[PDB]
Amino acid sequence: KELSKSDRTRQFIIESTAPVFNVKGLAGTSLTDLTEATNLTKGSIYGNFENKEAVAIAAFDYNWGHVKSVLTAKVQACNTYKEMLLVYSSMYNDADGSLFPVGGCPLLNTTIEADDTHDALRKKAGEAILSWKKNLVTIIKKGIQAKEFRPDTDVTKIAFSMIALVEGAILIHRATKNRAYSDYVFESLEDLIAGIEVKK
């Protein structure tokens, strides 16, 4: 069925403001940033969202939804389970980061801001991490059954360790502006997965 004018207006607000939220955060994103990005008035914007926090939550869902849809495309184009676990380097590094939203990883960006300021957004970050981990568990356990990976693999440890490596690699890149440094971490992620493979 068809989107209403309200649905389309909210969608436009989110699309226009999500890159600002991802770079400036909830605290650094002003009313003027919102109105300038949309050419809508305060009253129009807040006739579509309850408050700024509500806009920020939707921006997170959008930004993280975007990373997820890229990740899904890449995973679905893989021919082995191992390759599904190693799409991250190309996702982050290709096109100088242009496959990610402007401002980088929204899970990283949001957690750091919301963790001690904004429980509802902290909860979404938490749920995003745990859903990613769950997807990784599923891929790993399919790789075990396909005999790509060893049956005694500690699946949970590997899944969380993957997340830690990818996000830590991104941190190092954003702190240093040098992809060579983060490339070492993405190399360690491949070492991590190679270490679970059955002997060739």
Added chain:
Amino acid sequence: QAMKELSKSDRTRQFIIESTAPVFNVKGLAGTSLTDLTEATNLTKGSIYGNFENKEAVAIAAFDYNWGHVKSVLTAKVQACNTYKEMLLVYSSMYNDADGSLFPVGGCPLLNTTIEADDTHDALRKKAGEAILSWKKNLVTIIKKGIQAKEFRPDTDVTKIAFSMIALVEGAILIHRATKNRAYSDYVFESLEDLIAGIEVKK
């Protein structure tokens, strides 16, 4: 007036840094307002800005104090170890013991500063980069000693291991901060141990 001149001093400056560093670490430079600062210090705007040029100068000093604190803890824990391996694995106890009370309020300033500053604030991004690279250099120094003490193998890719450790520690913190559950971050610290076990000389 008279009060601005009189409240300019190294001790007042240090008190300002100490009082406001937990607020910057939690709220960030953009989220920290003047009334946050005057409430945290119980001092007037005049006393604060008689010791610092502007809020940004206060944020920079806060970062140096916050990270200097993490550095000092890591230094103290490393100097209590018997083995090079142990020195590489003090991170879990530093972040998890006494419910995180050894870390600054708000968690890791390097993580917290980088996410804010990376696309908004050159000076502070540069500080975070220098921090990460100094931490990396220290780790390399420890690993190389471990190699010459025959604790770790000579074929070890020291730079690769040093950056991966950093990733694992910061990634562990991130997961803990997002989920509020130390059991999840404990899996990452477990992989930090596995990384270092994997560079040990053959048994």
